[PDB]
Amino acid sequence: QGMQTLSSILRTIAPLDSKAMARATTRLDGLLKPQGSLGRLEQLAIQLAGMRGLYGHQVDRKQIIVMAADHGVYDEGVAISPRVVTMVQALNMVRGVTGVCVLAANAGAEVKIVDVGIDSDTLPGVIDMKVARGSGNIARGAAMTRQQAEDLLIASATLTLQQAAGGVKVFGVGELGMANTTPAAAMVSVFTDSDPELAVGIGANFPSEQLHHKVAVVRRAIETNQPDASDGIDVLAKVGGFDLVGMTGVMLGAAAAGLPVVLDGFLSYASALAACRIEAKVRDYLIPSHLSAEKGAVIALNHLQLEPYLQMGMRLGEGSGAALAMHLVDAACAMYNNMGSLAE
Amino acid sequence: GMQTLSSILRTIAPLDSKAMARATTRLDGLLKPQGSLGRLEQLAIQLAGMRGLYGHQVDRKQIIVMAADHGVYDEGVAISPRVVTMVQALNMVRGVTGVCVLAANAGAEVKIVDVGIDSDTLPGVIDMKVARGSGNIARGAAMTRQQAEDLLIASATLTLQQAAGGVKVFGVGELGMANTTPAAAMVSVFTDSDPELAVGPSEQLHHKVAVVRRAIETNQPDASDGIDVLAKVGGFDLVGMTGVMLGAAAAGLPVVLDGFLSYASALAACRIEAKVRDYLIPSHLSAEKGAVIALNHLQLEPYLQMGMRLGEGSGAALAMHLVDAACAMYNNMGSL
Numbered sequence: 002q003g004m005q006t007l008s009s010i011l012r013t014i015a016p017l018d019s020k021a022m023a024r025a026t027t028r029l030d031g032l033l034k035p036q037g038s039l040g041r042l043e044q045l046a047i048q049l050a051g052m053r054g055l056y057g058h059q060v061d062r063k064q065i066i067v068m069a070a071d072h073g074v075y076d077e078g079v080a081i082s083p084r085v086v087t088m089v090q091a092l093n094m095v096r097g098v099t100g101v102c103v104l105a106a107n108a109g110a111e112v113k114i115v116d117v118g119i120d121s122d123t124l125p126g127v128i129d130m131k132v133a134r135g136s137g138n139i140a141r142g143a144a145m146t147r148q149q150a151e152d153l154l155i156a157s158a159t160l161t162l163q164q165a166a167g168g169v170k171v172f173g174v175g176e177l178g179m180a181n182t183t184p185a186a187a188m189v190s191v192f193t194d195s196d197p198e199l200a201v202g203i204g205a206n207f208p209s210e211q212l213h214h215k216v217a218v219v220r221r222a223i224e225t226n227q228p229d230a231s232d233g234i235d236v237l238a239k240v241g242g243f244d245l246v247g248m249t250g251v252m253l254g255a256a257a258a259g260l261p262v263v264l265d266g267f268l269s270y271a272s273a274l275a276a277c278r279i280e281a282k283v284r285d286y287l288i289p290s291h292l293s294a295e296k297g298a299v300i301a302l303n304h305l306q307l308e309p310y311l312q313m314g315m316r317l318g319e320g321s322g323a324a325l326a327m328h329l330v331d332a333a334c335a336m337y338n339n340m341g342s343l344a345e
Numbered sequence: 346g347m348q349t350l351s352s353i354l355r356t357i358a359p360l361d362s363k364a365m366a367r368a369t370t371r372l373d374g375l376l377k378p379q380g381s382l383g384r385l386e387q388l389a390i391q392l393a394g395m396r397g398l399y400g401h402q403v404d405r406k407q408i409i410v411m412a413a414d415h416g417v418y419d420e421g422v423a424i425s426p427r428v429v430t431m432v433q434a435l436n437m438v439r440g441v442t443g444v445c446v447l448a449a450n451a452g453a454e455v456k457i458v459d460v461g462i463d464s465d466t467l468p469g470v471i472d473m474k475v476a477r478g479s480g481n482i483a484r485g486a487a488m489t490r491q492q493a494e495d496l497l498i499a500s501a502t503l504t505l506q507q508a509a510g511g512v513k514v515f516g517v518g519e520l521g522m523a524n525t526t527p528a529a530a531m532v533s534v535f536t537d538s539d540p541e542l543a544v545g546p547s548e549q550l551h552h553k554v555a556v557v558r559r560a561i562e563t564n565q566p567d568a569s570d571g572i573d574v575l576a577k578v579g580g581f582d583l584v585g586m587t588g589v590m591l592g593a594a595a596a597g598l599p600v601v602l603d604g605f606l607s608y609a610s611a612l613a614a615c616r617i618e619a620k621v622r623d624y625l626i627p628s629h630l631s632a633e634k635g636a637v638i639a640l641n642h643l644q645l646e647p648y649l650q651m652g653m654r655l656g657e658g659s660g661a662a663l664a665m666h667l668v669d670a671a672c673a674m675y676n677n678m679g680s681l
């Protein structure tokens with residue numbers, strides 16, 4: 002009774018409004034320019050026209066939802082930062098001093114920090130959605146139970162839908178989590194039928210001479226858990242983490258609202274792969290931002306069939322890249338709304 | 346009385362190495378893994394080296410759009426009627442063009458400059474008109490060397506005046522029916538490429554390649570001489586864009602490139618004074634066929650993959666957001 006079932010939310014994800022997109026195409030073709038000369042900006046304006054949650058290409062209010070959680074696989078020595086940095090950096094987000102904070106402010110976007118599994122108590126100014134104090138160590142077992150993954154998907158999609166009802170027009174995703182590039186690489190390996198050696202990157206400056214150990218840990222996580230690559234919830238629960246689940250839920254909720262959601266980098270690619278496995282109709286609500294510098298970025302993007310607009314060599318995460326692409330969503334709508342056709 | 350071009354160029358200095366070293370230290374100390382903001386960090390460092398800037402203050406931005414018609418229109422190589430240059434220039438004044446709405450969204454001004462439209466004087470447009478269109482580069486030079494040099498001076502002087510008026514970031518754009526043909530000619534000459542590689546089965550494409558080949562063969566420009574190439578196989582809009590780059594570099598201020606046409610102007614600008622290159626900021630990867638070769642010779646990698654080919658400065662407007670974001674990161678991110 003309290004919340005909608007996952008199945009019910011998924012069934013509200015509609016294909017894009019093809020008739021709206023056709024009208025938008027005709028309008029863009031008639032504008033003061035050679036046909037198709039604004040390329041992917043035109044494509045973006047048409048894609049947004051198909052999203053029934055929007056009205057008149059009005060996208061003023063934007064909100065990047067940052068999902069924070071700790072990971073049991075930190076115990077395997079795959080991250081160089083102290084584990085406590087997840088908590089401190091979440092507090093730093095409240096202070097407004099992190100990279101996503103200043104880039105979101107520069108883009109006029111809100112930032113909503115959500116605790117879905119930090120190894121800490123409740124944090125002032127951080128939304129309490131905490132499933133547990135850190136995920137299970139994926140190298141020795143599952144990150145979480147299937148039911149925990151499903152319930153968190155429902156909770157984070159529900160939050161997103163509440164924000165949609167409250168007037169948010171464009172979502173973005175980010176995360177915070179020491180060692181979370183290890184589950185992300187495991188998910189990408191499983192979803193793309195890739196050997197982990199192809200998908201495992203340096204994350205937060207993991208020493209290149211120790212990268213073989215990070216590969217070994219991811220390989221062991223997949224061997225131990227044997228996730229079903231066709232089952233997005235199973236992959237999330239077995240070799241994912243709470244932040245990854247939360248980002249998938251935001252994508253599901255935005256698509257269910259009929260609204261755009263802007264991806265970030267490698268971590269968000271893993272969540273996007275799981276979201277599209279759960280409901281393929283989510284893909285057309287996704288807007289890529291930048292091409293992450295993570296080693297497995299190109300493999301993940303190829304399988305999503307998405308081409309990011311920004312090539313910034315970025316690898317911070319937090320949603321900082323999603324913030325940058327917000328300007329492009331603005332630009333597509335500004336071109337659609339304000340550009341002349343036959344003013345004289 | 347006007348300054349000489351040489352006197353303007355003398356002001357162009359290499360980037361401030363110590364300032365860039367201090368910027369690198371500051372960025373490494375921010376609350377993030379070292380180097381994790383990648384090219385956004387190196388953009389903030391490049392801006393730290395530009396002595397015309399202070400405190401990564403980049404509030405005021407200006408895209409200067411150079412409009413001119415081209416004699417090689419006579420060879421039938423343009424995709425649209427010649428009058429489009431004039432009509433689009435008037436649409437700029439009204440603020441309804443692509444660059445206008447994108448610049449507004451980026452908080453940049455647009456300055457539309459007539460350097461050679463085939464028309465009477467146009468209201469709302471800056472009158473820098475050398476002539477009613479350039480010479481037909483297929484049959485002879487676009488302009489005399491003196492014409493190119495005097496327009497470089499005028500356009501650099503205008504840019505320097507805008508710098509003194511408070512503009513912190515420049516961008517360039519152009520309007521000009523048939524101007525991808527001189528652009529391809531310049532890129533071919535500057536990069537030692539056959540025009541087939543720089544011109545973008547069809548009868549029209551075959552003819553356009555032949556026209557570019559003929560322009561180079563007729564004019565035999567000296568590829569080592571950026572002014573000679575501009576004068577012989579360029580055009581007034583291309584000269585003006587080069588002049589904006591020279592003036593911005595002389596002021597020590599960044600200038601954001603647009604697409605294929607601006608790459609040709611940038612290649613000429615760097616032939617004229619190599620130190621200009623460090624003040625260039627690429628924007629998007631133009632979908633024009635010869636874009637990659639031109640960018641490779643400039644050793645620039647654009648940030649935006651938009652599949653755009655409109656021109657007019659529209660790509661420069663989009664990159665203004667990245668200049669803004671780099672400075673916001675540098676100025677506002679927390680440290681210890």
Ligand SMILES: [Cl-]
Nearest residue numbers: 213214217218
């Ligand atoms: Cl090992």
